[PDB]
Amino acid sequence: EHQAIAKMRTMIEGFDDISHGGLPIGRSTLVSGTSGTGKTLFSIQFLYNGIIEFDEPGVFVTFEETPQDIIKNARSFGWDLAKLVDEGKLFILDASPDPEGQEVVGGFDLSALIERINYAIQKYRARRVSIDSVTSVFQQYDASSVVRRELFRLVARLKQIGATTVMTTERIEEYGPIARYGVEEFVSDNVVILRNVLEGERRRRTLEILKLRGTSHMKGEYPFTITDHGINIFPLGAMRLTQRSSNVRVSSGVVRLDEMCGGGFFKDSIILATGATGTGKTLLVSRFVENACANKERAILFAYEESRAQLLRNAYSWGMDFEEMERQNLLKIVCAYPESAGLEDHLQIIKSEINDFKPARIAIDSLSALARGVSNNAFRQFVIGVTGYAKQEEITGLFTNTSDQFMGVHSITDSHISTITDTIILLQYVEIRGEMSRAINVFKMRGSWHDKAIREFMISDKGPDIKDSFRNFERIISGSPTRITVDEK
Amino acid sequence: EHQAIAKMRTMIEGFDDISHGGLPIGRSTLVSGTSGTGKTLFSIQFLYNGIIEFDEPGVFVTFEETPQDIIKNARSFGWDLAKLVDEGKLFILDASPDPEGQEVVGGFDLSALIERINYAIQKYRARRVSIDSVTSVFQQYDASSVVRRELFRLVARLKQIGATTVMTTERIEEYGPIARYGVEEFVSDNVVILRNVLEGERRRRTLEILKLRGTSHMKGEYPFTITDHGINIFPLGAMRLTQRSSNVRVSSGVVRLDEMCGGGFFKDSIILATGATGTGKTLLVSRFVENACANKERAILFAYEESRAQLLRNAYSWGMDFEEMERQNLLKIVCAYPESAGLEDHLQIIKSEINDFKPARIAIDSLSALARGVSNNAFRQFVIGVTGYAKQEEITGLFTNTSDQFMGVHSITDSHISTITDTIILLQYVEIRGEMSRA
Amino acid sequence: EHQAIAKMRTMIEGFDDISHGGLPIGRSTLVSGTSGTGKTLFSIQFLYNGIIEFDEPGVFVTFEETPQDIIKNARSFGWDLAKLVDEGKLFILDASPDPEGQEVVGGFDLSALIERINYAIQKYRARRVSIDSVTSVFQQYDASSVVRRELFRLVARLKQIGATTVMTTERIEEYGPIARYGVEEFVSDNVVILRNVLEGERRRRTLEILKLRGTSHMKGEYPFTITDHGINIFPLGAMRLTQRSSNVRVSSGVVRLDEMCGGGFFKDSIILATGATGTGKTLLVSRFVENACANKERAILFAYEESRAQLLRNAYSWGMDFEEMERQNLLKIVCAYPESAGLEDHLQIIKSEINDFKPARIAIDSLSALARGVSNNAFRQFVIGVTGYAKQEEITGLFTNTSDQFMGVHSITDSHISTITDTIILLQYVEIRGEMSRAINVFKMRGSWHDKAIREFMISDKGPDIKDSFRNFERIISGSPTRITVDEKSELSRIVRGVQEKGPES
Amino acid sequence: INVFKMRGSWHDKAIREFMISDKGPDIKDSFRNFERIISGSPTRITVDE
Ligand SMILES: Nc1ncnc2c1ncn2[C@@H]1O[C@H](COP(=O)(O)OP(=O)(O)OP(=O)(O)O)[C@@H](O)[C@H]1O
Ligand SMILES: Nc1ncnc2c1ncn2[C@@H]1O[C@H](COP(=O)(O)OP(=O)(O)OP(=O)(O)O)[C@@H](O)[C@H]1O
Ligand SMILES: Nc1ncnc2c1ncn2[C@@H]1O[C@H](COP(=O)(O)OP(=O)(O)OP(=O)(O)O)[C@@H](O)[C@H]1O
Ligand SMILES: Nc1ncnc2c1ncn2[C@@H]1O[C@H](COP(=O)(O)OP(=O)(O)OP(=O)(O)O)[C@@H](O)[C@H]1O
Ligand SMILES: Nc1ncnc2c1ncn2[C@@H]1O[C@H](COP(=O)(O)OP(=O)(O)OP(=O)(O)O)[C@@H](O)[C@H]1O
Ligand SMILES: Nc1ncnc2c1ncn2[C@@H]1O[C@H](COP(=O)(O)OP(=O)(O)OP(=O)(O)O)[C@@H](O)[C@H]1O
Ligand SMILES: [Mg+2]
Ligand SMILES: [Mg+2]
Ligand SMILES: [Mg+2]
Ligand SMILES: [Mg+2]
């Protein structure tokens, strides 16, 4: 073999994209992380995916967890390990000590274990082997200096066999040493780090590939999620800038708005409805949703502000009946607090809900509600995730944002999302004669002509009614206009 | 000789500029860094470049990675070491232990290793040696004081042979000790630190020369990128302020704009199109791109906001046909998210895309898109890289920035790039009679 | 001098000011620092300067570097140690271990080293000793308690001999302990700390004198630079406020501006040109540089924004020919990125270029370009350096600053430099009838009267033309004024109908 | 006093002044002849003939 490094696909969702193909074949891959990061899972899912997708038998070496529990715990993700053992596709090599025993057994077992490991490889014709918690065997009476030789023996032997290995290491500090003894990092050909970062009393699971000897990869951390389908990574940097874009138009739910946008929203576009509290962003959202059900198309409303009941109330008061929308299976509501999870989880819940309802339109009520507490950089990453996903899925997306300050209108978005979105719908309060009047304005459309006027609009039982602009007024954007009055030419 | 210290060129892109000539001849250089920094490559690339560029034979001493893998991993960059081994230009000295190890090697083995090296040096008439992972050999049962003498023995003996060496050392912290035992720094004549700094969930690789005993060098960290062409360093502080300038004018695509600029943009100038969102910077950029193809000149549009298709849609709706420009091979669109890489990588992608297309014009849509999350200093440093490169490459550059606040701009670029910009085109909204008109 | 301890001059640029006279004679000074800080150089340059300037023989004790390398490495600074060794003025004491050595030696050798040094001192009649990397000798198997007794033995004996010694020690952390074993700091009479502080991916070298038993010294860190001339320190706090000041006036290149300054800029003064980008600060600088060469005086233009060629282009577009100025050897352009080095380095390059050209005028385009990324406190320190240096050298200096916000900027300078400068030139944009017109104003001048009017100015091929002020206007400084009209039709030049031509033939 | 928003109701859009006395809070009339009331320091009209 006088070619480059051939990789084996792990079929772990997102991992093969960061690893540019997957783990290098015939080499050892070190997966380190703190307690509860998902190290044991990553090893299990590695062998399972190789069996079910490629018929490549696997050997699982455990040093602490009993084989009974390993199968037991795996049933969470709905995969029977006991079946693959019966089929001889998987062999859980019990290397865990018994409650009784003796000491002064340093590298005595290590030599014996290699023969036990190589045994299962030749016999089961194994191509993949995952060794869980290799550290736990040195946790007898050893130093860094001693661990290095025992590890290099195992790694070198496994490379000779021609088997692709995954090794699990346990950590104490999230950003300290990659491995316990500060040695494992340099013994392994490849380094993978599982992190469970705290910050803000929340948790964010991240995966990083520190190195893969002989190849390239994506540098940096990438957020993943442990679900009922195992590890799920979102390479939000791997998503390419090649989204489909057409000139197909769609109604906004408001006919006058469709005229103001030069014929309606683009089907392949992202719409932003920004305004102060009480302006009526949720109204446009509701209106935008009904129009999808008028053409008998599916759409999803992601609410993070109001409950499921209160949404029905405010909508019915606007005439539109959301009760019928759910019965006809054309509209699906979710409703969940932003504090209920992390942005990595919400991004998945959205993506998951989309594939199970194949929407043609989507409306997330308040992005600003999701930016609550979360850093701007982590939030901006969430936007690109949802935006790009719906963009390449031909789904028209309407997003809601509440500007922190009303009147004066300093910048559309405080978190600066106005450069990511395609169409900007601006709502604002206008102080006219002691009254808080509203004003709608299509701030921009990348492909359409759109109206330039700042038109007022009232709200009633019928819904939004757009009226005339403030032609005879000055400083309208400021929120506190000034009628100059034409005296008179 | 009775003069200054002679250096040996490494031919590594950027390094020889930083080391002011290359690695000093007859001395060992310590290249330390955490896991995945590119030490092994730096050692390999040091020997390879010596053979291919100077016909200087090399000896590679490995202490952990098996010799088969060294050649195997090298194939990624597209260079066959096995041929160099067969030609006797390169000798891979396997010093790695056997899977059936034994005990006590800290006296006869150091002499043995030197003997094997010296024999290898004399046999192949070698001029360069790279010893990979010297830390691994002390990892048996040694202390800092014991490591100091073993290194001092290793360095000095090699110094007598007259061999210019590169030594690889591993760390634990990125900004902690330079080496593992906190001793290797003062034993070596020259120190080089490879850093893989995290920050913001991204990784930035930097190169620093701590000291070159007897000579000068560039001080500080310098960002490098490991690609399919090996380590590529960008000494952004080395490039000189000697950019070429002429009175030649070029069209903007907008005839009336060319009148507003006194006859059009200069060819050797940096144009800045700033304004709030919706003002129409992409429009001016597109119109700037089309005019390049109208005069049958090549140009590159670096887009980081809109997709390739949406760019086509909006352009065609503006009349101009981007599709025809791609067929005639005068216009090339890249399109990539800012979060797809780091600024050290984006700078390279730009530079790489330029040399493969030799453009006459260049437009990067939304610099503010790249300024997402990244610190101000790292962004300004990235600007200098792209700005200075296009100026010296005779390429007219139009850049785009979206001011965070509409109406009340108060500042061209709030990131303050305009100070390094020659021509500024400003766009803004103006409230006229209840209507949003541009200016 | 009013100090209890007699000191010995190191002749290192700046150190004798920080140590208030040099190193105390008969005592030991500990110079410690991390790797590559310049420890060995300081000890080498300490012996060299003693030989060249005072014919004081020196003994160099090396514990790791080979004697041939000491001589080899010193040639970089243009120092022929091989000659000095041959002349018996310098003796390199090799105490370095063996590539084929045993183990265990750090006790009787310490007593033997005493007998070696005392032999070298007596034979060579040495007055200066440098023991480089004394730490490496305890780097065999020793602890802090063992170090204290062995150092004290070495130091005390050297003090008895009457030798002024410099001891080099290595560190791990830049701001942590002073030395490795945390013991050397209290055994020595004097402690000098060399630092290679990182911060912002750049490297800034500082020298600090922690203590001098028996005397005073300049407290705190002071930036130094290693060049082809060795260590160069900038005691930016030792620079006294005693510069010469005259009433002499010089032209600014712009005649109308000279009127606005009551007779032109002062010779011994600092000029600050402020304004938003595009106003024309670079223009005034060019005119300030041309007028010096037009009167046959030398001047240097320090540019940090534009290239050397673009400066030539834009100047020629303003008429003035910079090419001829370089030919006549009256004008010198530097041009360098602020990111190309640190403030300590830039400050030296500027100081160096001045001494190599002896200008009568100096001009630094965009100080705000040097304030990029650098903390305000470090930038201010740089400004004081250049400003103070130019002031005591009778060099007229014109500085440029670009306000980050245009039209309505509430301050002259964001870094608050307006109190260090003597004369402030203000440029700004004025929104008049949908047009961006410029305006110039002499904000302050220390010794003169100067014009108080905010006159607008146009820029053409001929250069800057100063016209009249916006008398019939309010809120000028705001950038977008409000037109009130009490007159404007009032005289000046009435008489309607026919009062002009355009035109004929010539 | 001003009801800035109500999710399920119509609510007054007027910024009406309100007095406080021994009897409690009493809401009165709006500042119709005033601009920039939200600013805090409004500008009157003319109250001419
Ligand atoms: N069905 C599931 N849904 C969601 N999360 C799950 C599910 N099953 C397991 N997990 C998560 O996986 C984590 C455990 O992962 P696993 O035990 O495979 O690796 P690990 O915890 O890193 O190994 P170790 O226990 O040795 O540290 C638990 O903290 C749990 O939160
Ligand atoms: N039945 C109704 N009749 C008249 N106006 C109504 C009615 N219901 C709601 N409104 C108006 O709508 C405004 C609320 O807007 P909406 O409920 O569309 O969401 P929103 O204001 O964007 O949400 P939030 O302010 O909670 O972020 C209120 O200020 C109110 O004036
Ligand atoms: N073809 C390639 N393209 C891009 N990057 C590569 C390529 N090959 C290797 N790399 C990068 O180089 C890094 C490995 O560097 P190298 O193995 O030379 O030294 P090191 O990792 O510092 O040493 P060690 O592996 O002993 O810790 C990998 O993390 C990988 O990201
Ligand atoms: N077909 C069209 N007809 C009229 N106006 C258009 C058309 N397409 C786009 N526009 C105008 O151009 C503006 C968008 O400008 P452009 O597409 O050049 O990018 P930009 O606004 O500079 O950047 P960003 O896309 O980040 O907002 C919109 O506000 C819109 O008013
Ligand atoms: N001609 C020169 N110009 C600029 N810098 C130089 C020159 N010669 C040497 N240097 C600098 O001097 C530094 C080394 O200083 P020196 O060896 O004197 O002390 P040190 O490195 O602290 O000692 P040690 O190596 O024992 O720690 C190098 O980092 C190098 O950059
Ligand atoms: N040949 C010329 N004719 C007319 N006006 C000119 C000419 N050259 C420059 N200008 C005017 O001068 C202004 C630029 O000023 P200058 O370059 O002197 O300093 P500056 O703008 O402060 O520098 P910076 O570009 O760093 O802001 C431009 O706005 C331009 O209108
Ligand atoms: Mg709402
Ligand atoms: Mg657009
Ligand atoms: Mg655009
Ligand atoms: Mg300038």
Side-chain angles (χ1 to χ4, degrees), chain C residues 216-243:
Chain C
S216 58
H217 54 81
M218 303 191 62
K219 280 78 181 181
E221 292 178 347
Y222 297 101
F224 74 95
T225 321
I226 299 182
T227 72
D228 297 283
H229 286 303
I231 295 182
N232 197 269
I233 318 180
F234 307 111
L236 300 182
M239 181 177 53
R240 296 187 174 184
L241 197 54
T242 326
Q243 2 276 35

Side-chain angles (χ1 to χ4, degrees), chain C residues 64-100:
Chain C
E64 224 153 41
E65 292 198 27
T66 262
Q68 325 304 328
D69 297 320
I70 280 85
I71 307 183
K72 183 69 175 185
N73 295 334
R75 298 189 184 273
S76 179
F77 311 96
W79 300 334
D80 196 16
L81 294 189
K83 178 182 179 182
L84 300 179
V85 174
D86 192 37
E87 292 178 331
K89 297 298 179 177
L90 170 62
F91 177 65
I92 304 182
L93 189 62
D94 196 340
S96 56
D98 203 39
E100 312 178 75

Side-chain angles (χ1 to χ4, degrees), chain A residues 277-278 280-283 318 438 459, chain D residues 5 7 9 11 13:
Chain A
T277 179
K281 295 102 58 179
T282 310
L283 171 63
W318 289 327
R438 291 92 187 280
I459 297 186
Chain D
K5 76 165 188 177
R7 284 176 172 168
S9 179
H11 90 77
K13 319 294 183 177

Side-chain angles (χ1 to χ4, degrees), chain A residues 5-25 29 42 46 190-192 207-220 222 233 235 238:
Chain A
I5 306 291
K7 299 172 179 173
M8 178 179 51
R9 298 176 61 185
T10 68
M11 298 311 298
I12 303 183
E13 212 287 85
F15 185 82
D16 301 336
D17 289 85
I18 310 178
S19 49
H20 285 22
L23 305 181
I25 313 174
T29 284
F42 190 90
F46 176 67
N190 325 284
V191 178
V192 168
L207 181 145
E208 181 193 10
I209 295 183
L210 231 191
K211 72 177 190 182
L212 295 161
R213 275 170 179 173
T215 40
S216 58
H217 59 100
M218 305 190 68
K219 288 83 180 181
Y222 294 92
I233 317 182

Side-chain angles (χ1 to χ4, degrees), chain A residues 210-249:
Chain A
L210 231 191
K211 72 177 190 182
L212 295 161
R213 275 170 179 173
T215 40
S216 58
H217 59 100
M218 305 190 68
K219 288 83 180 181
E221 303 186 65
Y222 294 92
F224 72 92
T225 310
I226 299 185
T227 72
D228 297 277
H229 294 293
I231 294 181
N232 196 267
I233 317 182
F234 299 99
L236 294 181
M239 182 178 56
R240 297 187 177 185
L241 198 55
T242 321
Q243 333 279 251
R244 282 178 293 172
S245 181
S246 56
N247 276 92
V248 186
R249 303 265 190 168

Side-chain angles (χ1 to χ4, degrees), chain C residues 291-311:
Chain C
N291 187 272
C293 312
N295 293 270
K296 301 181 179 180
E297 295 172 320
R298 290 192 174 182
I300 301 183
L301 173 53
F302 293 97
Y304 298 89
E305 294 179 329
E306 310 176 54
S307 59
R308 328 190 186 191
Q310 188 175 341
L311 271 183

Side-chain angles (χ1 to χ4, degrees), chain B residues 419 421-422, chain C residues 276-283 305-306 317-318 402 429 438 459-461:
Chain B
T419 161
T421 262
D422 297 331
Chain C
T277 177
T279 52
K281 292 99 62 183
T282 302
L283 172 58
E305 294 179 329
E306 310 176 54
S317 300
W318 292 324
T402 299
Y429 284 111
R438 293 89 190 276
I459 306 180
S460 62
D461 311 326

Side-chain angles (χ1 to χ4, degrees), chain D residues 13-31:
Chain D
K13 319 294 183 177
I15 310 179
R16 312 189 173 280
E17 62 164 343
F18 81 132
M19 43 132 293
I20 298 185
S21 63
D22 310 316
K23 304 176 182 179
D26 185 41
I27 307 174
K28 303 158 294 178
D29 292 318
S30 59
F31 303 84

